[PDB]
Amino acid sequence: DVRILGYDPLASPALLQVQIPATPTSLETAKRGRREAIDIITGKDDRVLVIVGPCSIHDLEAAQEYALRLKKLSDELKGDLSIIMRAYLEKPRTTVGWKGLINDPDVNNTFNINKGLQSARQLFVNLTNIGLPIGSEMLDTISPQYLADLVSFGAIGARTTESQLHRELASGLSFPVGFKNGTDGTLNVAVDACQAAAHSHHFMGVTKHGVAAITTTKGNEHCFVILRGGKKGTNYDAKSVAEAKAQLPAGSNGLMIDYSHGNSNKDFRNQPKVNDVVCEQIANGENAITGVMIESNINEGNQGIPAGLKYGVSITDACIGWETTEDVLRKLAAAVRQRREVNK
Amino acid sequence: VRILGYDPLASPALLQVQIPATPTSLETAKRGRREAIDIITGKDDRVLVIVGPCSIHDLEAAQEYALRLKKLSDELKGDLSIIMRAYLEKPRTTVGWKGLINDPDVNNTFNINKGLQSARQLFVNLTNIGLPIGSEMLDTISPQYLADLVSFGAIGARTTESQLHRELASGLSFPVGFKNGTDGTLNVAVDACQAAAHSHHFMGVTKHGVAAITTTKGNEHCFVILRGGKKGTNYDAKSVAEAKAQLPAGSNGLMIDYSHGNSNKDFRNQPKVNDVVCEQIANGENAITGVMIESNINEGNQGIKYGVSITDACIGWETTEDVLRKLAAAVRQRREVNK
């Protein structure tokens, strides 16, 4: 313990779950989000699954406002799109920086993780309680025990798609899991991850009672590849999509395309450009594209962490604002309708 | 719905009572760390060598290997500081045998409590003969059971980018080598060393086997391991010059893995990589402070024979002697250059 400063007590999952119960609405919402997401990625439904919302959540009330606008849009476009809100609680850093709402809910380097788990769970109940399903990046392998009952979708980030621990984690999650392609822009690691996660694994993990035990998973048949560009370039276009389709094994689920990150080339204004190219593929009969991801907030851009934060603006990566989001989604729903025409 | 179930797990503290370190084991681990630190931080002009099997599946074969390695270590100690690879955890490309801890019987029964007892008994057995050991830290819970015996940890190419493994390293009491990425570039290993040098706060399992919030202090003894990848091998002078060019101030010396990416998928290339690395060292390259060698009693591998790897192919004992004696010579030559 030369490099361990200390340990602080942590409430168990079971304890937090009693303290912050899911409402029946929250639970039905999470189940429905899972059902719709499965039906889409497995080709039973010809709608597109859309994971859309903030790069990260740092503000429960602004997250609620965003959610109410998203749910309204989602009610309008539900013939064409199954919408899940990005409610991301955990942020992998290039080196160091704010890791998200759980790790440091006060965003002031006090690292009050019990309050962070309380805030995260309260947030997930608040969003799902209005009938809006949520998804998050599953970065921590312990935190999902606190939150999994409320979640309809998990992502594994580009920096952890290759990680055996994250493939083991995904193999035991009760909802669909998207693996990002690697930061270098190649697909093989995400295809490999979906294979690995489809198998049962045995590994040490923390239970609802907060104790380590040996977990046996069943394997998760609802993992899919997310194309998110990378060093080798963007990969949302028809040729990259064809390339991806060629690498997918029998039994594979549909592809999801992330408009942001590697596919935006360091500029949120590019998300609508990626939309137009993806919509052209879909409208013209591409059925292997079953999902998209969009980094969207109330207002566009991002800001520094100095509290004196501007309302409704990301404190991590730059997002498109709400108004651009509505345009992009209506455009995407139009493309879904056209694809239906092509398929008849 | 996707959890079949949970089986009880002995706590780290329990297993530490059940399989105690000897005083020699503890001293050996401490010495291994001191020596590795002095090398990677430039205090000592010997080279640090992490050498031994791709993986351990057989404690008796590992012991006989250790006894040969400890004897060679005593011969070459003015020039090399040797730590044995005792790798218990193996990351797979998709699926396959994950190593001794996960499935000690190698038959898909997954008796993790027995794997942890075999792992700890193995680590005691090796350090008890005065030979320090090192392992890849894949599992973030496993180190609680074994850390007192370990002098070096590696983070594999597939997990150098993972925030969880950078957090882990920041709290380990020994030097940690981050492998470069599977694409063959070093940026992610440089970033990882930066990240692991900082204090972190995260949920982790304690010695009593319960989850708690850990605060780490940061690990200043992390270094980059050059291990090739898609982009090509990276053990040559140009690769080393490019690597030194991206190291921040305060960086530790580089380690070169002779195997994996650097071997073009062919264990017989490790002595060729040795020649090229020796030539740089002998001629005055002081940034190369460590090497890593996949070595066993007998050469090659086998699919799932005594002294032969069941994972990646290794060089055999005799080749290993020759490689390490040549390396030692290169170290002596570098001392001459630096005068």
XYZ file of C-alpha atoms in Angstrom:
683
model
C 0.000 0.000 0.000
C 2.880 2.465 -0.659
C 0.769 4.198 -3.409
C -2.699 3.812 -1.830
C -3.537 7.039 0.120
C -6.534 5.272 1.656
C -9.979 3.762 1.247
C -13.313 5.423 2.017
C -16.530 3.516 2.653
C -18.875 2.975 -0.226
C -22.645 2.253 -0.066
C -23.513 -1.094 -1.716
C -25.597 -1.304 -4.896
C -28.402 -2.952 -2.931
C -28.392 -0.113 -0.435
C -28.505 2.605 -3.072
C -31.279 0.763 -4.882
C -33.435 0.843 -1.703
C -32.627 4.473 -1.017
C -33.440 5.518 -4.628
C -36.078 3.065 -5.909
C -36.988 2.921 -9.583
C -40.674 3.851 -10.205
C -42.818 1.338 -12.150
C -42.642 3.883 -14.992
C -38.851 3.909 -14.846
C -38.722 0.106 -14.993
C -41.213 -0.262 -17.845
C -39.353 2.448 -19.722
C -36.002 0.703 -19.388
C -37.540 -2.630 -20.502
C -39.236 -1.050 -23.511
C -36.050 0.746 -24.599
C -34.267 -2.661 -24.530
C -37.024 -4.393 -26.510
C -37.087 -1.690 -29.223
C -33.269 -1.530 -29.450
C -33.036 -5.317 -29.811
C -35.761 -5.411 -32.509
C -33.892 -2.791 -34.468
C -30.347 -4.117 -34.269
C -31.564 -7.662 -35.009
C -33.493 -6.555 -38.092
C -37.085 -7.197 -36.807
C -37.985 -3.509 -37.016
C -37.110 -1.123 -39.866
C -36.903 2.013 -37.634
C -33.482 3.438 -36.736
C -32.191 3.316 -33.170
C -30.856 6.735 -32.176
C -28.685 7.315 -29.116
C -28.682 11.106 -28.722
C -27.880 13.636 -25.989
C -25.025 15.342 -24.115
C -21.375 14.363 -24.348
C -21.701 14.163 -20.568
C -24.206 15.016 -17.837
C -23.029 17.450 -15.165
C -26.347 19.166 -14.350
C -29.430 17.204 -13.363
C -31.918 20.028 -14.034
C -30.516 20.913 -17.464
C -30.505 17.167 -18.234
C -34.205 17.130 -17.310
C -35.030 20.069 -19.610
C -33.167 18.410 -22.495
C -35.036 15.153 -21.783
C -38.489 16.754 -21.918
C -37.730 18.280 -25.393
C -36.268 14.922 -26.562
C -39.279 12.926 -25.332
C -41.605 15.320 -27.172
C -39.683 14.930 -30.440
C -39.510 11.180 -29.835
C -43.330 10.927 -29.449
C -43.627 12.754 -32.818
C -41.051 10.678 -34.697
C -41.724 7.279 -33.104
C -43.008 5.699 -36.350
C -39.496 6.077 -37.797
C -37.002 6.395 -34.874
C -36.559 4.617 -31.490
C -34.832 7.273 -29.377
C -32.608 6.648 -26.341
C -31.055 9.575 -24.482
C -27.308 9.690 -23.964
C -26.987 10.097 -20.190
C -23.220 9.626 -19.903
C -21.846 9.415 -16.402
C -18.227 8.285 -17.068
C -15.728 10.002 -19.314
C -12.398 8.367 -20.269
C -9.714 11.031 -20.512
C -6.767 11.142 -22.915
C -4.570 11.710 -19.880
C -6.378 13.392 -16.933
C -9.483 15.604 -16.456
C -13.041 15.488 -15.083
C -14.186 11.853 -15.317
C -17.886 12.624 -14.917
C -20.846 12.878 -12.561
C -20.108 9.759 -10.526
C -16.429 10.431 -9.926
C -16.749 14.083 -9.015
C -20.344 15.333 -8.947
C -19.299 18.757 -7.632
C -16.835 19.218 -10.524
C -14.370 20.721 -8.025
C -11.914 17.902 -7.292
C -13.603 16.597 -4.123
C -14.398 13.195 -5.586
C -17.472 12.504 -3.480
C -18.266 9.202 -5.239
C -21.133 8.171 -2.873
C -22.925 11.459 -3.756
C -21.999 10.883 -7.403
C -23.654 7.436 -7.363
C -26.668 8.985 -5.617
C -26.857 11.775 -8.268
C -26.384 9.343 -11.163
C -29.118 7.030 -9.886
C -31.485 9.914 -9.155
C -30.817 11.204 -12.680
C -31.495 7.829 -14.264
C -34.780 7.521 -12.361
C -35.776 11.146 -13.343
C -35.149 10.588 -17.080
C -36.704 7.110 -17.294
C -39.648 8.217 -15.170
C -40.818 10.444 -18.069
C -40.821 7.472 -20.426
C -37.486 8.323 -22.104
C -35.019 5.398 -22.197
C -31.334 6.087 -21.470
C -27.903 4.735 -22.326
C -24.403 5.377 -21.012
C -20.798 4.375 -21.681
C -19.999 1.452 -19.398
C -16.481 2.502 -18.428
C -16.293 1.482 -14.758
C -16.906 -2.313 -14.315
C -18.326 -1.752 -10.774
C -20.790 1.113 -11.288
C -23.275 -0.797 -13.529
C -24.373 -2.761 -10.411
C -25.788 0.581 -9.131
C -27.603 1.632 -12.281
C -28.228 -1.359 -14.608
C -31.898 -1.764 -13.772
C -32.558 1.672 -15.402
C -30.384 1.368 -18.532
C -31.532 0.364 -22.079
C -28.188 0.667 -23.923
C -24.497 0.552 -23.043
C -21.520 1.680 -25.078
C -18.009 0.475 -24.723
C -15.675 3.355 -25.661
C -13.009 3.250 -28.371
C -10.257 3.153 -25.762
C -11.771 0.075 -24.047
C -13.219 -1.982 -26.892
C -10.024 -4.115 -26.863
C -10.108 -4.584 -23.100
C -10.835 -8.148 -22.005
C -12.439 -6.737 -18.837
C -14.944 -4.739 -20.807
C -15.800 -7.649 -23.035
C -16.400 -9.739 -19.921
C -18.586 -6.956 -18.489
C -20.705 -6.656 -21.653
C -21.285 -10.456 -21.707
C -23.253 -10.092 -18.500
C -25.221 -6.930 -19.173
C -29.003 -7.233 -19.680
C -29.255 -4.803 -22.596
C -27.698 -4.226 -26.033
C -24.056 -3.031 -26.044
C -22.338 -1.054 -28.794
C -18.583 -1.435 -29.190
C -16.762 1.499 -30.760
C -14.089 0.855 -33.358
C -10.517 1.530 -32.147
C -9.004 5.053 -31.886
C -6.830 4.203 -34.868
C -10.025 3.875 -36.972
C -10.027 0.118 -37.559
C -12.981 -2.180 -37.252
C -11.434 -5.526 -36.352
C -11.254 -4.824 -32.608
C -14.973 -4.017 -32.411
C -15.943 -7.115 -34.467
C -13.642 -9.185 -32.158
C -15.318 -7.600 -29.099
C -18.828 -8.492 -30.217
C -17.638 -12.124 -30.702
C -15.954 -12.252 -27.260
C -18.923 -10.658 -25.493
C -21.298 -13.180 -27.055
C -19.565 -15.973 -25.041
C -20.055 -16.834 -21.359
C -17.235 -15.555 -19.148
C -16.084 -16.358 -15.590
C -14.356 -13.518 -13.706
C -14.185 -11.766 -10.337
C -16.721 -8.949 -9.928
C -18.534 -6.980 -7.236
C -22.061 -8.093 -6.291
C -25.108 -6.041 -5.248
C -23.962 -6.551 -1.681
C -20.679 -4.837 -2.360
C -18.529 -7.909 -2.052
C -16.232 -9.519 -4.633
C -17.380 -12.908 -5.986
C -16.920 -15.113 -9.040
C -19.370 -14.078 -11.759
C -20.551 -16.421 -14.501
C -22.204 -14.647 -17.431
C -24.318 -16.132 -20.172
C -22.974 -14.162 -23.102
C -24.644 -11.193 -24.820
C -26.059 -11.796 -28.346
C -27.047 -8.100 -28.701
C -23.656 -6.457 -29.244
C -22.994 -4.419 -32.357
C -20.272 -2.327 -33.952
C -20.306 1.507 -33.757
C -18.352 3.320 -36.482
C -16.787 6.442 -34.957
C -13.819 7.183 -37.272
C -10.281 7.591 -35.903
C -6.688 8.279 -36.975
C -7.128 6.525 -40.364
C -10.028 8.892 -41.244
C -13.863 9.075 -40.954
C -15.835 5.859 -41.668
C -19.515 6.871 -42.077
C -19.547 6.776 -45.915
C -20.772 3.974 -48.209
C -17.349 2.436 -48.866
C -16.454 2.185 -45.157
C -19.914 0.832 -44.466
C -19.388 -1.856 -47.189
C -16.006 -2.628 -45.683
C -17.618 -3.096 -42.233
C -20.419 -5.298 -43.653
C -17.725 -7.509 -45.239
C -16.046 -8.130 -41.892
C -19.221 -9.056 -39.986
C -19.753 -12.749 -39.231
C -23.015 -14.628 -39.742
C -25.282 -13.828 -36.865
C -24.061 -10.209 -36.703
C -26.310 -7.349 -35.665
C -26.773 -4.110 -37.624
C -24.181 -1.306 -37.562
C -24.496 1.977 -35.747
C -22.797 5.180 -36.993
C -21.522 7.775 -34.484
C -21.829 11.276 -36.084
C -19.385 12.649 -33.557
C -15.851 11.927 -32.260
C -13.561 10.557 -35.030
C -16.392 11.054 -37.573
C -16.627 14.825 -36.858
C -12.888 15.612 -37.294
C -12.725 17.776 -34.174
C -15.761 19.965 -35.017
C -19.408 19.551 -33.815
C -20.633 21.410 -36.903
C -19.728 18.320 -38.857
C -22.443 16.154 -37.239
C -25.138 17.400 -39.684
C -22.747 16.697 -42.600
C -22.330 13.110 -41.427
C -26.140 12.979 -41.099
C -26.630 13.942 -44.720
C -24.283 11.237 -46.001
C -25.808 8.595 -43.673
C -29.345 9.599 -44.655
C -28.428 9.261 -48.342
C -27.341 5.688 -47.720
C -30.433 4.850 -45.705
C -32.976 6.559 -48.038
C -31.460 4.604 -50.946
C -31.961 1.213 -49.328
C -29.001 0.554 -46.978
C -30.499 -1.749 -44.379
C -27.268 -2.618 -42.531
C -27.288 0.844 -40.894
C -29.633 0.328 -37.969
C -28.409 2.940 -35.498
C -26.857 6.377 -35.211
C -25.291 8.273 -32.291
C -25.338 12.068 -31.887
C -23.726 14.373 -29.336
C -26.399 16.945 -28.639
C -27.092 19.448 -25.862
C -29.500 22.364 -25.214
C -26.864 24.757 -26.557
C -23.931 24.096 -28.936
C -20.205 23.981 -28.264
C -18.484 23.375 -24.950
C -16.798 25.346 -22.168
C -13.956 25.246 -19.632
C -14.379 24.219 -16.018
C -13.410 27.263 -13.840
C -20.340 26.893 -10.573
C -20.021 29.846 -13.010
C -20.767 27.370 -15.862
C -23.063 28.553 -18.662
C -26.399 26.670 -18.642
C -26.959 23.846 -21.113
C -23.443 23.754 -22.509
C -21.104 20.725 -22.385
C -18.127 20.765 -20.031
C -16.496 17.900 -22.047
C -16.709 17.521 -25.865
C -18.502 20.030 -28.158
C -22.120 19.151 -29.046
C -24.618 20.408 -31.613
C -27.349 22.571 -30.031
C -30.986 21.583 -29.648
C -32.223 23.312 -32.789
C -29.696 21.594 -35.065
C -30.637 18.325 -33.315
C -34.340 18.654 -34.266
C -33.367 19.250 -37.878
C -30.998 16.319 -38.045
C -33.578 13.944 -36.481
C -36.460 14.962 -38.733
C -34.095 14.506 -41.679
C -33.139 11.075 -40.403
C -36.818 10.094 -39.942
C -37.448 11.172 -43.558
C -34.648 8.919 -44.717
C -36.204 5.979 -42.749
C -39.519 6.568 -44.504
C -37.794 6.627 -47.937
C -35.953 3.386 -47.127
C -39.319 1.739 -46.489
C -40.418 2.790 -49.980
C -37.235 1.275 -51.451
C -37.779 -2.001 -49.532
C -41.324 -2.476 -50.967
C -30.881 -11.934 -17.076
C -27.287 -12.483 -18.336
C -25.748 -13.420 -14.977
C -25.836 -17.201 -14.525
C -24.705 -16.782 -10.961
C -22.057 -15.891 -8.379
C -19.788 -18.261 -6.509
C -17.970 -17.416 -3.287
C -14.514 -15.999 -3.489
C -11.817 -16.134 -0.807
C -10.673 -12.579 0.171
C -7.103 -11.383 -0.584
C -6.411 -11.204 3.171
C -7.606 -14.748 3.683
C -5.397 -16.074 0.882
C -2.432 -14.113 2.242
C -2.850 -15.961 5.575
C -3.365 -19.335 3.899
C -0.288 -18.939 1.648
C 2.119 -16.725 3.519
C 5.061 -15.029 1.923
C 8.373 -16.099 3.447
C 10.813 -13.421 4.659
C 13.025 -14.313 1.657
C 10.033 -13.904 -0.692
C 9.356 -10.438 0.713
C 12.972 -9.331 0.574
C 13.289 -10.551 -3.031
C 10.205 -8.599 -4.106
C 11.481 -5.458 -2.422
C 14.902 -5.885 -3.977
C 13.453 -6.457 -7.446
C 11.544 -3.178 -7.154
C 14.555 -1.194 -5.956
C 16.737 -2.520 -8.747
C 14.077 -1.923 -11.425
C 13.486 1.588 -10.217
C 17.231 2.488 -10.220
C 17.518 1.256 -13.801
C 14.435 2.879 -15.329
C 15.193 6.175 -13.585
C 18.809 6.285 -14.728
C 20.644 5.689 -11.393
C 22.089 2.385 -12.546
C 23.661 1.562 -15.924
C 22.625 -2.110 -15.928
C 19.714 -3.183 -18.151
C 16.502 -4.449 -16.634
C 15.405 -7.778 -18.228
C 11.901 -9.188 -17.945
C 12.355 -12.717 -19.193
C 10.453 -16.010 -18.992
C 7.374 -17.882 -20.325
C 4.574 -16.274 -22.392
C 2.375 -17.821 -19.666
C 2.657 -20.173 -16.693
C 0.468 -23.318 -16.776
C 2.742 -25.605 -14.762
C 4.288 -24.700 -11.416
C 6.941 -27.441 -11.538
C 8.194 -26.449 -14.960
C 8.148 -22.827 -13.834
C 10.280 -23.724 -10.814
C 12.921 -25.585 -12.830
C 12.984 -22.613 -15.246
C 13.426 -20.223 -12.246
C 16.291 -22.205 -10.851
C 18.176 -21.937 -14.198
C 17.294 -18.282 -14.466
C 18.416 -17.534 -10.886
C 21.734 -19.210 -11.590
C 22.264 -17.167 -14.809
C 21.077 -14.085 -12.939
C 23.860 -14.588 -10.386
C 26.390 -14.880 -13.267
C 25.240 -11.716 -15.069
C 24.281 -9.488 -12.096
C 26.982 -6.820 -12.657
C 25.324 -6.065 -15.960
C 21.668 -7.205 -15.910
C 18.878 -6.994 -13.342
C 16.661 -9.986 -14.116
C 12.990 -10.385 -13.263
C 11.141 -13.551 -14.315
C 7.925 -13.295 -16.369
C 5.376 -15.171 -14.339
C 2.322 -14.243 -16.345
C -0.950 -15.404 -14.888
C -3.477 -13.508 -17.042
C -3.708 -13.594 -20.791
C -5.902 -11.250 -22.880
C -7.329 -13.093 -25.873
C -8.060 -11.693 -29.309
C -11.602 -13.068 -28.916
C -11.814 -16.103 -26.637
C -9.452 -18.779 -25.372
C -7.568 -19.859 -22.220
C -7.138 -16.736 -20.039
C -4.397 -18.184 -17.826
C -3.692 -19.933 -14.508
C -5.968 -17.807 -12.283
C -9.004 -18.011 -14.488
C -8.874 -21.712 -15.306
C -5.991 -23.541 -13.580
C -7.081 -27.023 -14.743
C -7.016 -25.678 -18.353
C -10.276 -27.569 -19.040
C -12.990 -24.943 -18.994
C -14.042 -25.445 -15.326
C -12.903 -22.030 -14.103
C -11.933 -22.849 -10.564
C -10.797 -19.259 -9.771
C -10.287 -19.889 -6.054
C -7.871 -22.741 -6.940
C -6.283 -20.523 -9.624
C -5.643 -17.812 -7.071
C -4.132 -20.365 -4.639
C -1.940 -21.811 -7.453
C -0.970 -18.237 -8.495
C -0.006 -17.201 -5.008
C 1.812 -20.485 -4.219
C 3.720 -20.048 -7.548
C 4.672 -16.477 -6.718
C 5.909 -17.503 -3.262
C 7.826 -20.497 -4.767
C 9.635 -18.244 -7.293
C 10.432 -15.313 -5.028
C 11.467 -17.701 -2.201
C 14.567 -18.758 -4.257
C 15.510 -15.061 -4.492
C 14.223 -14.471 -8.051
C 11.957 -11.373 -8.513
C 8.886 -11.787 -10.712
C 6.662 -9.743 -12.907
C 3.246 -10.217 -14.471
C 0.802 -8.463 -16.782
C -1.837 -6.702 -14.662
C -4.976 -7.492 -16.674
C -7.480 -8.106 -13.891
C -7.986 -5.059 -11.632
C -8.978 -7.261 -8.585
C -6.227 -9.956 -8.829
C -3.381 -7.695 -7.718
C -4.878 -7.501 -4.192
C -4.038 -11.206 -3.838
C -0.518 -11.112 -5.233
C 0.998 -7.591 -5.102
C 3.143 -8.161 -2.088
C 5.182 -10.667 -4.162
C 5.483 -8.726 -7.450
C 8.382 -6.474 -8.539
C 7.128 -5.332 -11.970
C 3.756 -5.041 -13.704
C 2.983 -4.738 -17.378
C -0.145 -3.222 -18.920
C -0.807 -4.993 -22.196
C -1.137 -3.393 -25.624
C -4.912 -3.902 -25.570
C -5.344 -2.132 -22.211
C -2.777 0.650 -22.209
C -5.572 2.968 -23.409
C -8.008 1.882 -20.640
C -8.624 4.467 -17.896
C -9.226 1.566 -15.503
C -5.709 0.219 -16.019
C -4.105 3.671 -15.718
C -5.993 4.062 -12.403
C -4.773 0.656 -11.295
C -1.169 1.435 -12.114
C -1.340 4.751 -10.198
C -1.840 2.703 -7.006
C 0.634 -0.162 -7.573
C 3.754 -0.225 -5.370
C 6.154 -1.266 -8.184
C 7.297 -0.092 -11.625
C 4.692 -0.483 -14.402
C 5.474 -0.800 -18.108
C 2.828 0.331 -20.571
C 2.972 -1.462 -23.907
C 2.503 0.706 -27.018
C -0.833 0.281 -28.830
C -1.690 -2.695 -31.028
C -1.400 -0.314 -34.033
C 2.290 0.093 -33.273
C 2.407 3.727 -32.178
C 3.541 5.137 -28.824
C 1.155 8.040 -28.099
C -1.209 5.958 -25.987
C 1.687 4.546 -23.899
C 3.093 8.086 -23.334
C -0.398 9.340 -22.320
C -0.805 6.327 -20.005
C 2.446 7.066 -18.193
C 1.234 10.690 -17.744
C -2.167 9.509 -16.460
C -0.762 6.910 -14.066
C 1.599 9.434 -12.519
C -1.435 11.371 -11.152
C -3.517 10.607 -8.059
C -6.855 8.895 -8.878
C -10.089 8.258 -7.024
C -12.108 5.172 -8.003
C -14.116 2.172 -6.739
C -11.939 -0.875 -6.100
C -11.878 -4.091 -4.075
C -10.002 -4.089 -0.779
C -8.046 -6.783 1.080
C -11.251 -7.762 2.873
C -12.932 -8.365 -0.461
C -15.396 -5.519 -0.277
C -15.759 -2.646 -2.671
C -14.599 0.795 -1.406
C -13.388 4.145 -2.764
C -9.605 4.046 -3.395
C -7.391 7.089 -3.455
C -4.016 6.507 -5.119
C -0.991 8.646 -4.929
C 0.208 8.361 -8.502
C 3.046 6.157 -9.879
C 6.220 7.942 -11.062
C 7.821 4.637 -12.089
C 5.816 3.950 -15.264
C 7.667 3.598 -18.566
C 6.952 2.787 -22.208
C 7.532 -0.702 -23.698
C 8.190 -0.782 -27.474
C 6.469 -3.866 -28.884
C 5.756 -3.241 -32.552
C 2.230 -3.591 -34.023
C 0.339 -2.959 -37.297
C 2.533 0.046 -38.289
C 5.697 -2.215 -38.161
C 8.426 -3.254 -35.677
C 9.918 -0.615 -33.387
C 13.183 -1.880 -31.895
C 15.605 -0.201 -34.324
C 17.554 3.017 -33.967
C 15.044 5.097 -35.963
C 12.154 3.759 -33.836
C 14.129 4.496 -30.627
C 15.044 8.003 -31.838
C 11.336 8.689 -32.657
C 10.343 7.363 -29.257
C 12.848 9.508 -27.339
C 11.486 12.471 -29.352
C 8.012 12.044 -27.888
C 8.964 11.425 -24.250
C 8.135 14.386 -21.937
C 10.619 15.780 -19.470
C 10.776 13.555 -16.439
C 10.212 10.340 -18.482
C 11.804 7.033 -17.469
C 13.907 4.944 -19.856
C 12.426 2.788 -22.601
C 12.002 -0.947 -22.580
C 12.098 -3.011 -25.834
C 9.908 -6.165 -26.126
C 11.756 -8.606 -28.388
C 8.595 -10.555 -28.975
C 4.952 -10.019 -29.913
C 4.855 -7.286 -32.561
C 8.636 -6.982 -32.637
C 9.032 -10.615 -33.645
C 6.874 -10.559 -36.801
C 4.933 -13.506 -35.273
C 8.007 -15.770 -35.007
C 9.858 -16.483 -31.789
C 13.061 -17.295 -33.752
C 13.295 -13.555 -34.469
C 13.974 -12.650 -30.799
C 17.809 -13.142 -31.137
C 17.797 -11.000 -34.262
C 15.986 -8.264 -32.395
C 18.623 -8.784 -29.632
C 21.465 -8.057 -32.119
C 19.960 -4.817 -33.278
C 19.250 -3.749 -29.694
C 22.729 -4.760 -28.493
C 24.288 -2.702 -31.286
C 22.525 0.454 -30.074
C 23.353 -0.182 -26.393
C 27.023 -1.100 -27.095
C 27.478 2.115 -29.089
C 26.163 4.433 -26.385
C 22.355 4.346 -26.357
C 21.434 5.161 -22.746
C 17.657 5.577 -23.323
C 17.233 1.790 -23.693
C 17.005 0.656 -20.082
C 15.019 -2.563 -20.310
C 14.230 -5.548 -22.578
C 11.508 -8.189 -22.433
C 12.008 -11.756 -23.720
C 9.589 -14.639 -24.119
C 11.584 -17.662 -23.015
C 10.906 -21.140 -21.716
C 12.770 -24.389 -20.966
C 12.118 -25.653 -24.481
C 11.405 -23.582 -27.592
C 8.150 -23.089 -29.505
C 4.557 -23.645 -28.449
C 1.798 -26.301 -28.549
C -2.033 -26.235 -28.910
C -4.376 -27.044 -25.940
C 4.923 -31.574 -23.479
C 6.991 -30.404 -20.479
C 8.615 -26.952 -20.588
C 6.757 -25.873 -23.739
C 4.344 -22.852 -23.904
C 0.601 -23.384 -24.404
C 0.183 -19.753 -25.624
C 2.762 -17.819 -27.778
C 6.014 -19.427 -28.931
C 9.110 -18.809 -26.758
C 12.854 -19.211 -27.320
C 14.398 -22.159 -25.495
C 16.746 -22.106 -22.506
C 19.998 -22.414 -24.467
C 19.114 -19.568 -26.849
C 18.111 -17.534 -23.789
C 21.597 -17.944 -22.220
C 23.187 -16.819 -25.437
C 20.886 -13.816 -25.819
C 21.401 -12.663 -22.226
C 25.198 -13.142 -22.292
C 25.333 -11.051 -25.461
C 23.140 -8.431 -23.812
C 25.394 -8.308 -20.774
C 28.408 -7.731 -23.084
C 26.585 -4.864 -24.800
C 25.994 -3.327 -21.302
C 29.742 -3.553 -20.549
C 30.567 -1.870 -23.878
C 28.131 0.973 -23.187
C 29.930 1.574 -19.848
C 33.134 1.936 -21.852
C 31.516 4.442 -24.223
C 30.104 6.530 -21.341
C 33.621 6.961 -19.853
